[PDB]
Structure formats: structure tokens, C-alpha cells
Design a protein around this ligand. Structure first.
Ligand SMILES: [Ca+2]
Ligand SMILES: [Cl-]
Ligand SMILES: [Cl-]
Ligand SMILES: [Cl-]
Ligand SMILES: [Cl-]
Ligand SMILES: [Cl-]
Ligand SMILES: [Cl-]
Ligand SMILES: [Cl-]
Ligand SMILES: [Cl-]
Ligand SMILES: [Cl-]
Ligand SMILES: [Cl-]
Ligand SMILES: [Cl-]
Ligand SMILES: [Cl-]
Ligand SMILES: [Cl-]
Ligand SMILES: [Cl-]
Ligand SMILES: [Cl-]
Lengths: 224, 224, 224
């Protein structure tokens, strides 16, 4: 009955709870960046735009690669408003109370695990979306699923440019971090599953690969 | 009978007279930039391409955001040729006579006022165009109308890159100028008018907001 | 019977032999770049991505200008695999034997001449493709044919950025090289031929302009 459990796991509604955890962890990483708090005070619109890049950068990159509107996902008003509320509560909550609650390690590890549920589902969705437009475009499937999982990391050089920072000596492609490298393995596995060369159901691959990302990210977050 | 006057005001043909004033003021600002005259002598094609960015950057940004061809507007041959003639007359007219005529303050203030007529119409057109593709995409309407009014300012970091200049410590989003900040207020007003939440006709909003931009820009130009 | 010869010349199958020569010369130029060999050892994926930019940058730029998927051409699996094999054989062949064979001057000059056959055909294809979408878009035809011939040269500033290099003081538009400047003349000639204002058959223009590029590039390669 594992496939019955994996089907319910791979079909959980990501909105709004799982997307909220994705937004919280992403905007928390934004606040950790240098000058982010100062930027939210002096340039609040640029700070909000930076948070939208962290929350929706995966959709922006996928739409750019597929020749679609890079802000197509911003038509989902509920998701944009929810991400805006997360950005406001993390940077402007009185007593910084929202930051204190989500940074609590037992609460943070749960949001980190819920973010990996959204990431793996986003990788598979990128492969399936590209396959619908190119039935045999294996390199397009792998590229689309890769940026859907890496997200804002692949546009870090220009996320820094929006903040007024320019460090061209490195990029996430020249030196991949763990989520970027893991999303590359993920988009290859989901592409092979699309080719029917990887004999496994799509729900089982979502379940097993999400648990791999959950165990890795929770261990990496709790260690540091 | 104000709505009768506002209807005639909001429907004036921008081509070619009002677009010419838009091109003249934009290329004049290009010539004010450092090394622009030297660039027109040593790299004339790059100088012409820079002038097209100042004349058509609003259309380039809007088409990029909506996933359309960024040079789609360059199919309008009459507008491209007219902008090319303005660029040639400003940089290469014998005795620099064309520059002397358009830089005359009474003539320059008229071209500045006529440019604001094109800008406000461009903001409203960006909101209406985005609404046609997304009936409830409020954030897409606001983004499209914003870049239609700001124009080349939002791509200043890469307009400088084309000229061989790189100043990443600032950008028009991190520190907005007046036209960029005013276009943000304008695209919100025209979006609210599209939502039918702002109880005012589209022609009255075009008339009142253009006069606001005309008064501000003419006062800012005559002061300095 | 020249038009009979020019028709057979302008219709030779570029795949796979002529495209292979295009890939070999392009990846050879990549290996000549600073730090390229070191990059292939420490960042092999970024090195492969760099080689795809040299092999397919003309298609990436044309699809970007026309608002199509910038990786649309990567659906051609045979071409991507062939370019990947060329990249692997140039950087990782035992004894560096593949590099030694293709760098042999009599063999290199043949691959250089075969690359110009692909470039001129790519320029004409860009003009014809843009004309199909814009029957009278002369500036769109010229821009599309230009990037189809220049290729990765017009994106050199960002090909360097992928490698961790940033030299913004110059670009291929501010200071054109010979292939970039020749592709600009080529796309104007093929556009004029599309307008029916240049009284010459499309096959004769392909034949005469390819021989011009072959003579120039072979002379430039053998001299240095
Ligand atoms: Ca498109
Ligand atoms: Cl940083
Ligand atoms: Cl602000
Ligand atoms: Cl998704
Ligand atoms: Cl997707
Ligand atoms: Cl098919
Ligand atoms: Cl400057
Ligand atoms: Cl030039
Ligand atoms: Cl418009
Ligand atoms: Cl528009
Ligand atoms: Cl609808
Ligand atoms: Cl270099
Ligand atoms: Cl790697
Ligand atoms: Cl082609
Ligand atoms: Cl093409
Ligand atoms: Cl037509």
C-alpha cells in the first residue's frame, strides 16, 4: 500500500501552508544577506522586489527558458499577497516577533522540510511542463526542472545587482551549492521517469526524493 | 463639457509630432551622458543603438515582461526612421544647429511637455495591454504600466554597459528618480481605474495625470 | 549554369558534417580563452554550458529577439549530443589527440571554411524567419540575421560572466570584430534580397557571400 501513501504524499495542496513555509525560509535567507535590513528601511520597494525574486525566482527562470512571460506567475494574486505578507512580517513586525517565532529551531526545521516538498514538486512540474511543449526535448526538460528547483540561486549575480552588489568572480553554475546540485540530480531523475526509462512511478519518485531532500536540508539546517 | 475636452486630449495622435518630442528629449539626455559625443564618433552603430534604447526602452521592457518580442515595436518602420533622424540631427547636424534649436529653453519646455503626453498614454496602454492578457492580473498590469512610463531608466545599468560603463552600486529601483517614482504612482492609478475601484473615467485620469506630469517636468526643466 | 551550381551549394546538408566543423572551431576558440582548461577540470558542467553558448549562441540570441524560447534549438538532441562530443573530445581526449588533429593547419582551415558555410546560411535563415513573422519588419530582419551570424560574440560579456570574468570596458557592439561586422553587412544584403530591391537570387547571394567569408576567414586563420 506504499503507492497509496505515495499518491497522497505527491498530491498534497502546496497552497497555502506549504508555499508559506517556502516563502518564510526564502525571505529569512534574504534577511541574512548583508545590508538587507538597511535596504528594507531605505529602499522598501527594492526590498519587496528582492523577496519576490526569492519566493518566485523558480517560476521566473522557467518562464524565461520556455519563452513565456517571466512574471506570468504573478497573476496568482493570493500567492503574491501571501509572499508580500511574509516579507512584511519578517522585516517590519513589531518587536521582530514574527522573525523570533519562525527562527525558533523546532519551527524552522519544519518550514525547511515543508519547503523541500514544494521544491521537489516544482522540479517535477518543470519537467512535465517542458515535456508538454517538447515530447522529446530531454535537454529542455532537464533545464526547466533544474531552474524550478534551484530558484533564485541561479540568478544570484543579478539578485545582488538589484541590491547594489556585484561579485562576478563566482556564480551558482561555476560553483554549485547543495540545493542547486541536488536539483540537477532531481531533474535528471524526473526526466528519466518521463522517458519511461526509469522504471518507477512518478509518485514514488516524488516521495523518495522529497524525503532525501528533507533529511539533507533538516540535517544541514540543524547542524548550523 | 470637461469630459468632452478630456476625450479629445486623451485621443490626440502621438505620431509623429508627440513621438518626435519624445525622441528629441530622450536623445538630448543621451548626449548629456559622459562620453556620448566621443562614442558617436568612434562607435556610431553603438551610439545609434543607445538612442533606440532611450527612444523605445519602454516598449522593449514591456514586451520582455509580457513574454513578447523585445524588438516587436521596431516593426514600425516610420517610428524607427524618425528616431534615427533625431539621433543623426542631434549628433551630426552641421554647425550643431539642430541641437541649438531644440535646446532653446522655450522650445525645450514644449518638447518636455509633449513627452509627458506620450508617457502617460504609454502607462495607460501598458495597463490595458496587460489586462487584455490577464483580466485579474493586477501585479502584471502595474509592472507593465510601470516600465512603459519609466522606459530606459529601469535598464540604465545595461545602457551603461553598452557604452562601456559599469556602476553597479546603484540602480533606478534601489534609488528611484522622479519619472520612475511618478510612473509607479501612475500605473497604480490606471490599474485602479481598470479594476473599476477608482470611480473616474479613463480620459479624465489621462488628462489630470498628464497635466501633473507636465507641470512637474516643465518646472524641473526650467529650474535647472 | 552558375545558378544550377549555386542552388546545389546553398542547399548542402549542414548536419552533421558542416555543423561539426562549426562546433570544432567554436570549442577550439573556447579552449584558447584564459582559464578554460582549468575550468573544464574544476567546473565541468559550467565548461559544457560555455561550449553550448559557443555552439548555439546564434540560435539563443535569435530566439530571444523574436520572443521565442532561448533554448528552443536544444530540442534537437542530435545536434546537442554532437556538440557535447566535440566539447568532450577537445578537452578530455587521451593524449589530447583530438585537439592535435583538428588544430593541424590544413585540417583547421577546412573546418574554418565549412563554418562560414553554416554562418552565411544562418544569417539568411534569420532574415527569412523574421520576415515570416513580420513581412515588412526590415529592422527585425536585420537584427535577427545579425545575431544568427555573430553568435556568441554578441554575448561575450555574459559568456565571460559565466566563467567568472567581468570586463565591461568593451563589448562586441562598441568595438566590432570582423565576423560581427561582416554579419552586419550580410544581414543587410540578405534583407535587401528579401525586399526584392537587390536584384539577385538568394542562392547566388549565399554562394558569393560564403566565398567572401571563406576567403577572408581562411586568410585570417592561416596568417595567425
Ligand atoms: Ca514568448
Ligand atoms: Cl551578497
Ligand atoms: Cl522605495
Ligand atoms: Cl510548479
Ligand atoms: Cl513549470
Ligand atoms: Cl512531437
Ligand atoms: Cl553614466
Ligand atoms: Cl560602428
Ligand atoms: Cl503605447
Ligand atoms: Cl504595452
Ligand atoms: Cl480569466
Ligand atoms: Cl576573457
Ligand atoms: Cl560541475
Ligand atoms: Cl539556421
Ligand atoms: Cl532563425
Ligand atoms: Cl502584414
Amino acid at each position: 500500500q506504499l503507492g497509496e501513501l505515495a499518491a497522497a504524499f505527491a498530491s498534497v495542496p502546496v497552497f497555502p501552508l506549504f508555499d508559506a513555509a517556502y516563502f518564510i525560509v526564502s525571505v529569512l535567507y534574504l534577511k541574512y544577506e548583508p545590508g538587507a535590513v538597511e535596504m528594507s528601511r531605505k529602499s522598501p520597494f527594492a526590498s519587496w522586489l528582492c523577496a519576490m525574486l526569492h519566493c518566485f525566482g523558480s517560476y521566473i527562470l522557467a518562464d524565461l527558458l520556455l519563452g513565456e512571460s517571466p512574471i506570468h506567475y504573478f497573476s496568482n494574486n493570493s500567492s503574491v499577497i501571501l509572499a508580500t505578507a511574509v516579507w512584511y512580517l519578517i522585516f517590519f513586525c513589531p518587536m521582530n516577533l514574527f522573525y523570533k517565532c519562525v527562527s525558533f529551531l523546532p519551527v524552522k526545521l519544519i518550514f525547511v522540510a515543508m519547503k523541500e516538498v514544494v521544491r521537489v514538486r516544482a522540479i517535477a512540474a518543470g519537467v512535465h511542463h517542458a515535456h508538454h511543449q517538447y515530447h522529446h526535448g530531454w535537454f529542455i526538460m532537464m533545464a526547466t526542472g533544474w531552474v524550478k528547483g534551484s530558484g533564485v540561486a541561479l540568478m544570484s549575480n543579478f539578485e545582488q545587482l538589484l541590491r547594489g552588489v556585484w561579485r562576478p568572480e563566482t556564480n551558482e553554475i561555476l560553483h554549485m551549492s547543495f540545493p542547486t546540485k541536488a536539483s540537477l540530480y532531481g531533474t535528471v531523475l524526473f526526466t528519466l521517469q518521463q522517458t519511461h526509462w526509469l522504471p518507477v512511478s512518478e509518485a514514488n519518485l516524488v516521495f523518495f526524493f522529497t524525503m532525501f531532500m528533507i533529511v539533507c536540508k533538516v540535517f544541514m539546517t540543524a547542524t548550523h
